[PDB]
Design a protein around this ligand. Sequence first.
Ligand code: CLA
Ligand SMILES: CCCCCC(=O)OC\C(C=C=C1C(C)(C)C[C@H](OC(C)=O)C[C@@]1(C)O)=C/C=C/C(C)=C/C=C/C=C(C)/C=C/C=C(\C)C(=O)C[C@@]12O[C@]1(C)C[C@@H](O)CC2(C)C
Ligand SMILES: CCCCCC(=O)OC\C(C=C=C1C(C)(C)C[C@H](OC(C)=O)C[C@@]1(C)O)=C/C=C/C(C)=C/C=C/C=C(C)/C=C/C=C(\C)C(=O)C[C@@]12O[C@]1(C)C[C@@H](O)CC2(C)C
Ligand code: KC2
Ligand SMILES: CC1=C(C#C/C(C)=C/C=C/C(C)=C/C=C/C=C(C)/C=C/C=C(C)/C=C/[C@@]23O[C@]2(C)C[C@@H](O)CC3(C)C)C(C)(C)C[C@H](O)C1
Lengths: 73, 168, 176, 87
Amino acid sequence: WGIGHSMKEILDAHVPPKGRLGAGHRGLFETITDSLHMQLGLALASLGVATSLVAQHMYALPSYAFMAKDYVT
Amino acid sequence: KSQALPFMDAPAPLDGSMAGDKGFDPLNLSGSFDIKWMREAELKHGRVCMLAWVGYVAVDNGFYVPFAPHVSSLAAHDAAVKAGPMLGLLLAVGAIEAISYNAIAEMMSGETDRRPGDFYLDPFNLCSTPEKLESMLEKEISHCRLAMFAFSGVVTQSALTGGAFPYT
Amino acid sequence: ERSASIPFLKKPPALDGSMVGDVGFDPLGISTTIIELGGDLRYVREAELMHGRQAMLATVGFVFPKLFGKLPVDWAKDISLNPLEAQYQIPPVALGQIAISIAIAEGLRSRIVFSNDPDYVVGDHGFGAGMLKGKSEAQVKDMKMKELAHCRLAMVAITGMFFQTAITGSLYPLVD
Amino acid sequence: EAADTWWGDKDYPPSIVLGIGKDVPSSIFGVTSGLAFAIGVYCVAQSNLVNILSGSTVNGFYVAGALLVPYSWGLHVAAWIQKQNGK
Ligand code: CLA
Ligand SMILES: CCCCCC(=O)OC\C(C=C=C1C(C)(C)C[C@H](OC(C)=O)C[C@@]1(C)O)=C/C=C/C(C)=C/C=C/C=C(C)/C=C/C=C(\C)C(=O)C[C@@]12O[C@]1(C)C[C@@H](O)CC2(C)C
Ligand SMILES: CCCCCC(=O)OC\C(C=C=C1C(C)(C)C[C@H](OC(C)=O)C[C@@]1(C)O)=C/C=C/C(C)=C/C=C/C=C(C)/C=C/C=C(\C)C(=O)C[C@@]12O[C@]1(C)C[C@@H](O)CC2(C)C
Ligand code: KC2
Ligand SMILES: CC1=C(C#C/C(C)=C/C=C/C(C)=C/C=C/C=C(C)/C=C/C=C(C)/C=C/[C@@]23O[C@]2(C)C[C@@H](O)CC3(C)C)C(C)(C)C[C@H](O)C1
């Protein structure tokens, strides 16, 4: 419906002005879509951060009633 | 070459051919953004203002439908929201505006030659010849511009005064 | 170019005619995203057809127990009004037969639909053939168009009936 | 597909990076950037000058105006982009 971003243009635009990061993120859109190993690697990295976060926050801030007293769960 | 502001020339060349063109755009928003969206918004605002002025007058006179507790048009909004059918009217308007989402999205980016605010709700062929279409477009847009001020004044006078039909 | 239903919208490129009820009504473009997957419109037409047929049988079944009466057999102490609340008083020793009959019918229909065969006219299950012999293509097309119109009307109708009896007490012009 | 948006061989991005606002001149962008920044800072200051309460003092207009502070960042960046482009 016309509105919205194109992910290719966002990646191709993000080049620092004078060669600080090389050619920027040009060509990253074609590599990610055509490689299922890069998408899967990003997914596993994010999910690993997420489940470590749930490990920290479920003992730090318990949400289920009458836990933090069983101690074994 | 501007008409309304004779010390200027054409606030971008966007103002060259459409109906109701008087060169009046001092803040250059005609050239900053695409003018089809502006004309769609203008026509849509004017049509809303026309029906809103017609409804605000008629409810303030005594035209009341079955049920619909007889209250002035100032409190009719709250009375009918507490009654309920305002939500159904909102749902119907939302369906029409989903179709309007589709229409405006098709109009702006190629693949459809729709005029801004066009639709095709023309049962009686009052715009068959192009000259009749131009005349009716001029009358429509002039009525839009007049009815915006008309309904704005009606609402403001009804809100600040106690309330009558001529609004003092 | 432009659709025959919504005149200010573009014509759906998948809905190019040659099908019953093709008035070019697809603002979301469901059929556009079905054929670019390499599929066709046989399955969605079959779904619409039996949705409408169940809708017609439903429209008769909402109104029949209260407008006319119940079965002469026993155990019919279910509420005459509120069919949606009369679902839960059905004894299991009738639900078993209902479920078995629908199960075998839909197993046969699943064998028909999901097979592969290209000679299968959509909706032509073979149950109804006693009246279409000796008819031209125009008569069959008109008959299928009447079926599709009744399908869509009955689906809108049953949505109305279910949303009326659940919020309001009952249907206004016929009940209570 | 899309448009050639890469500008690694130029000192400024092209005007097409602004999308729907690719034709707005730089002066409008800068004036709206200053106005949006001022209004947004005022709206977020109405949450610490006055203690925001549980429902009593929330004032959703100040919430909607609070989104102008990140919007003011994008407007002054787009002002620079249009200025280098000559628009
Ligand atoms: C007087 C104001 C006015 C004028 C001159 C026009 C003129 C035009 N409109 Mg338009 N329109 C108006 C108001 C007006 N409109 C309003 C208020 C709405 C909102 C509903 C619309 C919605 C609208 C749509 C959706 C479409 C048009 C179209 C058109 C064009 C062809 C139709 C035509 O000849 O209409 C001539 C108009 C008249 C002779 C006016 C008759 C006066 C009526 C009878 C008054 C009725 C008031 C009544 C109380 C309202 C009840 C509300 C209730 C039923 C909901 C033409 C340029 C069509 C178009 O551009 O396609 C080519 C099109 O698709 N208009
Ligand atoms: C056992 C055989 C099958 C029997 C079942 C049956 O029925 O047959 C199927 C059949 C054809 C057939 C065949 C037979 C010839 C019969 C037998 C053949 O078999 C052989 C071997 O020959 C098979 C077949 C298929 O060829 C034909 C049946 C057609 C049928 C049953 C069509 C009903 C539409 C209802 C509608 C549109 C409701 C609208 C309701 C509307 C529009 C409303 O507005 C209602 C509502 O306003 C109300 C009233 C009040 C409001 O408050 C609420 C609302 C607003 C909602
Ligand atoms: C009317 C005012 C007049 C003065 C202002 C002004 O116009 O100057 C404009 C100007 C310079 C200039 C001019 C030109 C345009 C070049 C030319 C002009 O001449 C013409 C017309 O050509 C003259 C001149 C000097 O004006 C420069 C503008 C610079 C500007 C506007 C810089 C904004 C940064 C924003 C940031 C860093 C946001 C951080 C935002 C943050 C950190 C957040 O969002 C936090 C957040 O919690 C928030 C707050 C809300 C939450 O929801 C979201 C979260 C939680 C994330
Ligand atoms: C989205 C779901 C939905 C659909 C698809 C749908 C379709 C139709 C159709 C077309 C087939 C017709 C012809 C029709 C007609 C009437 N409907 Mg709908 N209707 C739906 C929902 C509701 C709800 C929630 C209510 C309601 C009612 C009425 C009344 C009563 C007016 C009166 O009493 O005079 C009448 C005449 C109200 C009612 O039950 O009585 C208060 C009520 O609350 N309807 N309705
Ligand atoms: C097509 C299209 C669109 C669309 C659409 C729409 C509106 C689609 C709607 C489809 C719809 C509405 C499909 C209903 C099915 C309901 C059925 C089959 C109910 C059967 C009901 C049964 C079998 C009930 C039987 C009962 O026995 C029970 C349970 C108890 C008894 O006491 C009473 C009775 C006998 C009654 C978009 C999205 C608008 C745009 C897009 O681009 C194109």
